[PDB]
Every structure is written in C-alpha cells, then in structure tokens.
Design a binder for these strands. Structure first.
Lengths: 97, 65, 59, 31, 82, 104, 95, 95, 107, 95, 79
DNA sequence: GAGAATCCCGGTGCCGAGGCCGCTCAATTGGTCGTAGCAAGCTCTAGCACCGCTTAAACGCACGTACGCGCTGTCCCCCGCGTTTTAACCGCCAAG
DNA sequence: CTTGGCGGTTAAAACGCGGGGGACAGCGCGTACGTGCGTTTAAGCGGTGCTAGAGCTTGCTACGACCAATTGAGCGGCCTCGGCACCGGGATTCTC
C-alpha cells in the first residue's frame, strides 16, 4: 500500500508549522471560550474583534513558548515524548505554581 | 411648600434582602439580612459587584465618590 | 419591582427587562396582604406553592 | 449510603422554590 | 450561558501548537493538561482585562484593556497599541 | 524644528510634550527630548535595517511582522531587550532538536 | 475623530533612509509604533526614578543617558549613547 | 541633623494591636519598612497608570481600589478592599 | 480650633497626611482625591497586620518573643497569596523553607 | 562510618534551619572588588552594600540549586549535574 | 583570580540549603561562572547608579536599586 | 526504483501600500522671573590598611558503596491513514 | 461596531484499527563522589591610625515653566496601482 514511518510526517509538520505565521487555534470556539470565561467577572460583556485577536495571539504565543520548555524537559529525561510531568516542571521552574 | 414630607421614629421589622422572608440576623463581611444557611451560602459565594447591589436595592449603598 | 427581578434572577436573564412591563406585572399580580408577618413567613412552603406562584412567559 | 439504603437535591433547598417553583429545574429549553 | 467550550481547544489544534513548539511525540494526557493551563492563563488575563474595563465604566472590553492586562502581567504584546 | 536643528527624523517637540505630561518629573531638560528622540531613532533604524534584510531574504519588498520577529530574535541584544515582548503575527524561529532527527 | 497620532511618518522616513526600496505593512507598522512607545515609557520611567533617587526634580539628558546605559544591553547602549551625544551636540550648534 | 522619616512607629503600633506580647528586631523592622514602601510604590504606580489611561488627572479612591484589585491576589484583595472601604466611609462620616 | 489627625478620623494607625504628601510629591498625578490617602493607608495597614500576625505565630512556634526575619520568611512563604505578592522579593537573613524531596529520603 | 547519604541529609536539615550567610565574607568581598574594578577605578564599597550583594547572591544561588535539584530528580537521578543547571537557567530565561 | 575564593564546600553548603543530596564535580566551576555573571550584571548596574550620582563610593541603595531593576527586590537595606 | 510531496515557474485577480490634499491645533518664536541647580566651602562619618594569632575551615587523600550509565526484553501507546461525522468558515443584511 | 442568523460549503475534527517505534522496568560493569581523618591555608578577629569623600550649608545664577502670537506639520480622508496572495502545471527531491 502506502505507509509512512511514525515520526516522519510529524517532523514535516514541525518544519511546516514553524515556517508559517498564521494562527493555529480555531477562531470561533476560542472566542466562545473567552466569552464563557469572561461571564464570571462581568455579566453581559461586549468584545472588540481586536481584543479577541489579541487574546488569541497572547494565548498561542504563551502555549507555544511553554511547549518548547516542555519538550526540553522531555529530552532532559532521555525521552522524545512530552508528558504532563514535563509541563509541571516547566511551569514550576518558570515560576507559576 | 414641598417640605411637608415627614420621617418616622419607630422600631422597624427588618426583613431579608436576598429573599423576602423575615430574617433575624445580618453579616459582618457584607451586612446582608439573611434567612438561613442556604442564603448564607449564596451570600458568601456570590460573584463580586452584586453584594453592593443588594444594599443598592435596599438603600444606603454609600458608593465611593 | 424591576430591581427585585433584576436581583432575583441573578446569573443573567435572557430578556429585556423594561420598566413598563414590570409596571403591568404590578398592576395585575400584586395585592396588599391583610396580616403580613404571618402570611410572609409561611409563604414559600412547598405545600401549596403551585397556587401562590404567578408565572410570566417571554417571546 | 447505598449499602444502608439497600440494607434499609433541589427539593430540599428553598432557593429553587424561590426562583423556579415546585416543578423541577430548567433543562435549558426554548420556552 | 452556553455549554462546555473547554473542549473547543481540540486535539489537532494542541498538536499544531506542539508542532510549532518543536514537539515530535505527544502523550495522551497532554491535551487535558494543556486545556487546564490555557484555562488558568485566560482566567488570569481576562480578570484583569475586565477589571480595567470596569474602572473605565465601560460595558465593552476593548483591545487596550487586554494590552494593559498582558503588560502588567509581564507579557507585553505589540501590534494593538500601548 | 528642533528635530531639524539636531538632524533627527523623530519629533523632538512631540517627545518633549509627552515628557511634560505623563508625570515623570516636575521640569524637563532641554536636551533630554533630543537625546531620547535620538535613541528612539537609532533603535528604529537598527530594527528596520535588520528587518529590511530579512525581507530581502524572503524575496519581499514590504516588511511583514514575521520579518520583525526574525530580526529581533536573531539579535541577542534585541532579544534581551524584547524578552518579555510578544510580537503579533511573528511565529517562531525554525528550531528542531538534534535528538528529534530521524534515525535507524 | 480626535486626531489619533502615532510615530507612523517618522518610522516610514527612517525606513526609507535605511532601505529606499523596501516597504512595510500596516501590522508591522503598528508593532514598530508599540515598540517606540514601550521604549519611551521604559527610558522615561527609569529616568524619572533616577531623578527621584537623587532628590533632583529635573530629567536632563544625563538621566536619559544613564537610563539608556541601564536599559539597553551591550553595544546597543554604546551606539545609542553616541547617537544621543551627537544629536544634543548638533542641537547646541544651532540654537 | 536632617531627620529621616520611617514607618517604624506605625508598624510598631500595629504589632502591639495584633500581638501585644511579642517583639520585633531591627532587621525585621527595616524589612517591614521596605515592604510597605514597595507596596506603596506599586499601588500608587498602578493607580497613576490607571488615571493616565482614562485621560484623568486625579487619583481618587476608585483608582486605588482598582489598583488593589489588580495587584493583591484573591482573598487578600477582598479583605483589603473591605478595610479600605470601611476606613474611607468612617472618614467620610466623621468630618 | 482643636485639630485632629486624619488617621484618627479614618480610624487607622498609618499616617494619612504623610501618604497624601508622598502621593502629591511623588509624580503620580496632577491632582489626588481625598479618599486616596485614607484608602491607601488602610490597605497598607491591613497588609502589615496580616504579615505581623502570621509572623507572631511563627515566632511563637520557635519559642521566641521577638519577631526576626526568619519568622517573616516563614510567614510569607507559607501564605500562597503573600508568597505570590512577594515572589520576586528576597528577604534578607530569612533563609528558606525546610523542604526535602521524597526521593532523597532514606530507603 | 555512616552509609553514604546520611551525613548529606543531616547537612540539608542543618542548613535549611539556619539563616546566616554561607560564603565566606572576605573572599566574596575580593571577588566583588575584582568584578567592580572593570567598571570604575578606585572604587569604595559600603559594608552594607557588600552584605546586600552577598545576601542576594546566596539567595539567587540557593533558588537556582532548588530548580537544579528538581531537574536532576526529573531525570530519575539524585545527583545534580551541569545539564540540570543549564536547563534551569534556560527555562528561567537567563541563558 | 578571586573567583576561586568561592570554595568547593561553600558551594556544597549552598546546595545543601537548596536541598541537594549528591553533587557532581563539574557543578562547582559552573556555579562559579553563574555567580560571576550574576555579580557582573548587578555590580555593573550598581556602579552605573553610583556614577550617575557623581559619587566614588557605591552605596547599599545603589545595590538595592540595581537588584530592583533586575526584578529581584531586596528587603532589609532600605528602599 | 516507485510515490508522494515540497519546490519552482509562469499566469492572473485583487486590495492594501503609498502618494496627494484639506486643514486643524500643536510646535515654534520670544520675554519675565521664581527658583532649582551649580558650586565652592566645610564637618566628620566611615571606608581603607594592617600587625600578629587562635583555630575553624579549607584542603588533601584513602577506602568503598551507592549511583550514573549503558544494555535490554517486553508491554503498550501514540502514529499514520482511510472513512465518516461535524461545525468552523463565509457572505451579509440588519437591530441597536 | 458588535451582535444574530439564515444556509451553504468542505475542510477540519472524530472514530477506528494495524503496528512499529518508544516509554519503562530489570540488571550489571564500573567509576565518580561520599565519608572520615590528617595536613595546612588563611578567614576571622580587633586595634586603630589615616583620610577619602559623603554629607550639609550658603551664595550665585543660569535653566525652564509660563503666557502669548501664530503657521505648518501631521492626521483624516480619497484613489491609482503594483506587491503579493492566489492558482495550477510540472520540476524534483526526500522517503521507504
């Protein structure tokens, strides 16, 4: 048939998404999430489009920055797969918890 | 003229201001009359910005200046 | 009446709460009770709340 | 409690009777 | 008030983020953890943003509120003002 | 203008007005907005230069934010200056760890 | 309208100085503007704290220079300082 | 002699209020002083930025309250706003 | 005319007038409201009390009747909110929290 | 002879209770002046300044050693190695 | 060569307070390097503050300001 | 050596970058003057240098065992991919 | 300028399954580091003279806010166009 070795097209995905600059998280459900979280602080909020775009940029930047440190925490433990403990350690050293 | 409105001086029966039931005791943190422990639970976990609106509905909010 | 329906339905009511519709609620759903402190304290009991309660739709 | 009941909610609280009534809760319907 | 939306951050999206972050292999328990972290993050940001909105006595959260929130949180964001 | 008298492109007058308000100090020096506008013009020049080169490498003539990100992150000093700064529509630098490269 | 201003025209001029045949998009321009404003607030703030620490109620070019020496790392500082001392010299050659 | 002010007597009074039978070392005194100074600079700074953001030239109690809501976390902020409101109300009443 | 302090009228201990002066001559704004000094003094006094209380507790734990920097450190690093407030703050002569990982414990 | 690990834990319990400085005073002073002699000639140092430098230095080093130890344990090891320090510094955003 | 003044058992003690059971041999030199860089930055900023104040004696407040501007506020020395 | 799958190249539809223009309000020009800042002058806190000395501590080293580290078999859990289910995306007029 | 809502699309998200590369527990050779005692370096001690230089004070004076007159620099706004996103045939380069 036509198969590919596990870890090849994933690496190609890394090289492709690192080259691109467009946003990754889907816009509409993220906006829905933002509006869902905001309803615990002020009832009936209105949002500028630029505000939601800013929140999405900051969030994706934060997460993509965290995934690097996570990946480093995974390689430090002689592994290639990221694990929850790697995220925990990353955020711990980062000074968040 | 227009100064014929008169206040009172008498004991007032203080009712609840979350519900309408008669309530016998208030709070130190938020100063709300309340009926029983369910209303006390809903008072102590209400989102901020509303514990002042109950005193706004009852009066004497005393908002900042 | 508008303030108490705004604070009763606490988590957000999906509906325009005008003043005039609360006035028409007051016009046909309010009556001065004869003996207030006895009527009030046993009003929200479960036995018979279905006939005290008055309910209002919205489109 | 299941072993005791086998061996042997909203209807308790008044806030559901105050907001909604003796009928059960709102299932987030249209009307 | 809608339903859930924490599941809106779907699996392939988190996978994409990991790809841009340079991750070859991802665990299964990564996604829920990421949803939690993102939830905490967005909470911390939106709280301060809404605070700035309330101090301005506005009912509409502007972009500048988000920018101020991020800046005072220690993550300055360019391309929106400030 | 004071910008022309100092050979600067950035507005000395506007910088002086901004320093006047904003509650920084009581009175503001006369050479202070000149110096400040000069520094801003220098930094602007450096970033726009490096980003221009980055745009040239991508066969583009209009600088996109991606070029700005590439310029800043490829300069340790500029990266240090903008360490806690997130550039919108900038992406990340291409970086794949050595142990992630295919083997066997 | 209220005439919302920025550092647009100046950034464009300097861009055409360092690169005559190179343009810039709107988003990148906004980012450059935000950068200029950020550095401005940082330098002016540090200068303000400098003046306040020494019980002096004036932000002269000295406080600005020290602020640059504190903020900008390495060569970026050096060059900047030079570009400052140059400017403030020329301003004193035609005033 | 040039007298230098400090928050010593005040934190001492507070100490006597909360713990009448405990003492305080000079080092810890200076630490508490630096603490109060730091928070003062923080809240006042954030309040200043708040006033500047809304084109206002006056820092009222509202700006201070919002600043405290932004800086102090959770229940600490709640009790802080509580004590602040009590104090400003009692001050408003007693002329 | 029988003067009284603004701190006494506000029912506080921290100096209201001093805080007001610092706000005025601190380059924060052109004008400052009358509620700002009493509010700020109240917040500072409250935070002061919250630290001194836990510090007194930690002092009592070490059988000492004088609060030392160590007691302040133990007070702040245990209170999560206070710790977050002073996360980028180093307390001199305060040491660290006694914390040993489970892996390093004897087998 | 104790088994190799007991004395180490005893030292950990010993120094986690203490608060006094660990690095010797005079060598640290000599190091401070050696590093300072490349910025300003014939520098005079206040004793409190050197003490502050040492307090902050030891605090920073201990804080880094905690994270380093965490990196060591994360790799299923009970020994800190330069890789751990470099990783800690990297995540903290210093390297 | 005063960086060797910071001795091996001193770094060991600091590691103990940090909660470290076993220490490698390559740790000490690394620690000396990190401390050297940290002190370089802090003292650089401090001397900058000193020279701005037209003084030839770096005070404790200069150290406090330098540490504060690096995001490492220090209580117990003023400020 | 088969098979995708990036890259390259010539063509084309499109909209945002760039230049012009009306014109408003902020920068410039210019003079008084309160005063912060320069600055010489002067008191004295405090930093620097250092002679010898008890000794804690750094250093040096031998013995050895817990531990870093390479090797390895086995359970298993993500990877890749086709199919199927689902909602994000888009146009876009319209209430407020 | 944000919000609602058709309905129409289709790429993206879900579900499922074979299976291959990797997490992970077990084991063993070996060396790097811990523990303890002897040798040795110099930190810590204090004694205090010397004086640099921080700190304060008074006097002189040059700096900059401040009101006022006023003109163009700069922002909002309009429009032709060319960089660039788009698009599809085919070069071609990694992969298995």
């Amino acid at each position: 048939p036509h198969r590919y070795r596990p870890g090849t097209v994933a690496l190609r995905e890394i090289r492709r998404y690192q080259k691109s600059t467009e946003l990754l998280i889907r816009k509409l459900p993220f906006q829905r999430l933002v509006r869902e979280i905001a309803q615990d602080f002020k009832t009936d909020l209105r949002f500028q489009s630029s505000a939601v775009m800013a929140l999405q940029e900051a969030s994706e930047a934060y997460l993509v920055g965290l995934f690097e440190d996570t990946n480093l925490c995974a390689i430090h433990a002689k592994r290639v797969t990221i694990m929850p403990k790697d995220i925990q350690l990353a955020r711990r050293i980062r000074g968040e918890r | 003229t227009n100064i014929e409105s008169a206040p009172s001086l008498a004991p007032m029966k203080h009712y609840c201001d979350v519900t309408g039931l008669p309530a016998p005791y208030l709070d130190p943190k938020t100063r709300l009359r309340y009926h029983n422990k369910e209303i006390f639970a809903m008072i102590r976990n209400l989102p901020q910005g509303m514990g002042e609106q109950f005193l706004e509905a009852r009066g004497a909010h005393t908002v900042l200046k | 009446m508008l303030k108490l329906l705004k604070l009763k339905y606490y988590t957000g009511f999906p509906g325009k709460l005008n003043s005039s519709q609360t006035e028409h609620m007051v016009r046909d759903f309010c009556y001065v009770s004869l003996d207030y402190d006895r009527e009030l304290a046993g009003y929200l009991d479960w036995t018979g709340l279905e006939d005290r309660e008055r309910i209002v739709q919205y489109p | 409690x299941x072993x005791x009941x086998x061996x042997x909610d909203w209807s308790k609280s008044l806030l559901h009777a105050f907001r909604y009534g003796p009928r059960p809760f709102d299932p987030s319907s249209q009307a | 008030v809608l339903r859930d939306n924490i599941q809106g951050i779907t699996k392939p999206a988190i996978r994409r983020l990991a790809r841009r972050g340079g991750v070859k292999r991802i665990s299964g328990l990564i996604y829920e953890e990421t949803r939690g972290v993102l939830k905490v993050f967005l909470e911390n940001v939106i709280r301060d943003a809404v605070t700035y909105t309330e101090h301005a006595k506005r009912k509409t959260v502007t972009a500048m509120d988000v920018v101020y929130a991020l800046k005072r949180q220690g993550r300055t964001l360019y391309g929106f003002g400030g | 203008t004071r910008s022309s008298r100092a050979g600067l492109q950035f507005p000395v007058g506007r910088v002086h007005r901004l320093l006047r308000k904003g509650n920084y100090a009581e009175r503001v020096g006369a050479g202070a907005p000149v110096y400040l506008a000069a520094v801003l013009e220098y930094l602007t020049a450096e970033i726009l230069e490096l980003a221009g080169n980055a745009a040239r490498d991508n066969k583009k003539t209009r600088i996109i934010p991606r070029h700005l990100q590439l310029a800043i992150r490829n300069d340790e000093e500029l990266n240090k200056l903008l360490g806690k700064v997130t550039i919108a529509q900038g992406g990340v630098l291409p970086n794949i760890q050595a142990v992630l490269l295919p083997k066997k | 309208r209220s005439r919302k201003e920025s550092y647009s025209v100046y950034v464009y001029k300097v861009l055409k100085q360092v690169h005559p045949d190179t343009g810039i998009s709107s988003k990148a321009m906004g980012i450059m503007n935000s950068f200029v404003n950020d550095i401005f607030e940082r330098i002016a703030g540090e200068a303000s704290r400098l003046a306040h620490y020494n019980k002096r109620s004036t932000i002269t070019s000295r406080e600005i220079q020290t602020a640059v020496r504190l903020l900008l790392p390495g060569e970026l500082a050096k060059h900047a300082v030079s570009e400052g001392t140059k400017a403030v010299t020329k301003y004193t050659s035609s005033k």
